[PDB]
Amino acid sequence: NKCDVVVVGGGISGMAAAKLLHDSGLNVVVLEARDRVGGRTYTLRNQKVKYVDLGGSYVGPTQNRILRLAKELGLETYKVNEVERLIHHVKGKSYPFRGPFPPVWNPITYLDHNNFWRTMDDMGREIPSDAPWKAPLAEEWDNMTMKELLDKLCWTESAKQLATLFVNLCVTAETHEVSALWFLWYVKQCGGTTRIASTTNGGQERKFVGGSGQVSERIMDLLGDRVKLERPVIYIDQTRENVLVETLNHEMYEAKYVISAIPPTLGMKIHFNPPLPMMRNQMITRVPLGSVIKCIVYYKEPFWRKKDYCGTMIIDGEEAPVAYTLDDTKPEGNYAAIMGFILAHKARKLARLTKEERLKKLCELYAKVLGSLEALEPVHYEEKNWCEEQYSGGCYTTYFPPGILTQYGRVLRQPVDRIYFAGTETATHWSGYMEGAVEAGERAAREILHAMGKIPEDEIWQSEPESVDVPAQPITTTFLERHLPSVPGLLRLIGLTTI
Template sequence: MSNSGKHDVIVIGAGISGLAAAKFLHEQGLDVLVLEARDRVGGRTYTLKESKTKYVDVGGSYIGPTQNRIIRLGKELGVGNYKVNEEEKSILLLKDKVRTFRGSLPSIHNPFLVMDYISNWRLFDELAKEIPLEAPWKCAHALEYDNLSVENWMDKNCWCSFTKEVTTMFVRLAFATEPRDLSFLYFLWYIKCGGGLLRFISTSNGGQERKMIGGSQLISQKIAERLGNRVLLSNPVNKIDQSKDDIIMVTVKSGEIYQASYVISAVPQAIIGRISFNPPLPALRNQLIQRMPMGSCIKTIMYYDTTWWRNLDYCGIALSDDIVGGTQDDTKPDGSYPAIMGFINGQRAREVCHLTKEERKERVVQYYCKAFNSEKALHPVDYIEHNWMEEEFSGGCYMGATPPGVLTSYGKVIHKPVDRVYFAGTETATAWSGYMEGAVQAGERAAREILHAVGKIKADKIWVDEPESKEIPALPFETSVVENMIPSIPGFLKFCTATTSVATAGILVYIYRDKIIDALK
């Protein structure tokens, strides 16, 4: 196929979202061309293949129940998956104090900590339920929530420093940013996007349950193989010109100009601003892309001779407020290439990004020695890292998130086409935004918008639910009666005040019972 002449659709970005869109349109008979700035496909999924590691994902890699689109796509493309190890105990390290636990949430014995921690996390789920996935800015309390950062909300509602510390750790690990920089409305919406708090944060039965055999970049590589020379690498787009009625002119860095009837932008919102538009982007769209920064993330993988942590009854999951916010066992499914993956995120990433690779490695192994309480952590056989803040065509990872005030002021344009330019990318998803699942949903939705524009489908077929995977079904989470009934600290104090008042009244009635009886005669 020649890439000269006019195409039906040009897709900008050969990550999972752009390639999912291109695949969908190609299968519907449209002439598609994909322009990718990098010298590889995959976007924020990136799999290195070396003799020392076989393969390793230094970008996005996790899938799980309810992520039915990426599961379907992986099955169709012949990409297998395996469960991440969670057989043994997990670790929580806060303020240099180590706690061990099994499951998604750590056990705590102080009753006031339990009340504050459990009730606040339960409240996140309750508040998230009221957020419309397709339009969080329409929530009844949208302005109230959006004007707060997560830190503001914690300052107003958390009684115990432990609750604040755990929530800060969670925000840093899940969003690669700090609570002060994240809108509380966006935070709640994101939890709902992930199917609720437990689904979102869990490994088993949650968003981090599985990885792909051979690496997640295989998804993009296999789609690109199907599309053949319709995918052009090393072609960053500089300009999109829609000034003519029937044609869009797309100019790349080399000066080459490609023509199409429609365009799909599948790059992060923060990167769109590098493209010159004629006519200029509408005001709110132009302002939005300046206000959706990418997360700060350095992904690390430490290799060892053995899975020594399993011998100590640790599964490899360690959550902390230290340099590495969260870890997972990254050993291959057959037990080969023992490794621990760790994320350095948010402020921690910014604090160490100026160090050399060897200096960061030393910081990480020292942390593992402390967290797992083992000198064996100090003797890795290999170390790999990828600093996503240095990625020219991503600007960070995992995704762009909105600071306070942005979602209600600008969010309504995130899905809105600009004339014949449509927008994909995981940030525009309404299910598992920030994950590979969100990338597929957004890409296929943008493709359907174009199919509707050309008269192939009706408007009610643009947003389509995905059937649940039979191979990876979502199981219900079991919570105890105590977890469901435990009050918040304010609720407990009100109860105590009420019961004390009743008891006091009862005592007074008993003391003055004769006088009361005489008065009633």
């Protein structure tokens, strides 16, 4: 019934919000739609897997908030296996390699590829993290899709193909579905193309021992009975002195303030009194989440390491159900596994199959990519299609189709009277990740603390000390990487000696 702050959503964002509120002396309640906490993080435990992350999993350098929160809860990280070779599978053949990107040998193609990544970061540096619609060419970049941008930038099909796979993997959407401005913001606010895409030194470096689900669960442990499970929120009424929050099992909660810690578009599941202001009312119908099936295939041994493959595959081509994989072997060396994502339109297309038909297609793909008949011998399989989640809407996160971010972006975290907005989508650094979740949750909690007169305004946004355990190597370039011409820039140099 009565408390200081109702937190809607028990994902990482709402749990981190609740925790900061609770540690500061406020009476908090978390109302969660599902019969579990964790949201888009979910750790399954059974005998056959021990544990496995079926939703968000990876943490890496620069994600300092989630590392600190997890560390304080008693959690530990281990490194994703990248000891052996990565594989870039393109046009029906596998090419082993090491480093941030597969090596390009054709010099034209090398210029084009180098120019593409460079330009992505170049554009991204024009986009303020906390205000992407403030980019000088915001309008122009928002009024085109990533497909149209790739068409302009890539003078080789090779670069276009690789870039398409990058977009699909980063935002589980098609290049034609997303705003170029948004997508360029999304990469920048994660530290750029190298940081977002890498294992060592990047987004995919680590996982938590025991699963990421422990983050939400351990905060629930601390909060005790303050976390109401199976309370989907249906109605928020701010016409009276205290905010009123009603659940689907007709329970009523009364609070000074509310934090909405749910993906933006799921705000539609809530009836508002009085109605949302116009801009938000429309924004939450315009912000879909991606489509992905996260699949884990278990084997007797991590046989791929014996062939000097670490288990990372970048797999191009329409016939390939999975376009990206990682080694998911437990740190102790057992429960050998390959994690792979079925992305965007393929998540849609292949959801029609049975679980056993999807397993079959994945083993056959891995057999071919790894040149290994053993991949045909799985011992177990787990999978999650995030598109069927009523209380997620998809994964990993919310994407912005063209024209949306500049028109409606401003309102994503604008308070509505006594409702404040958390959820990874409102973050300025690793939005879409567990990291963005902790940032948006703690920031929304702090907005309410300033509203109550408990902290000055300059404590609303707070920077984070760098993890001592997972430190960040800078993202550096080389001279030639910086100054090699693009393909048309070389065509321009050729025109000039010929004139």
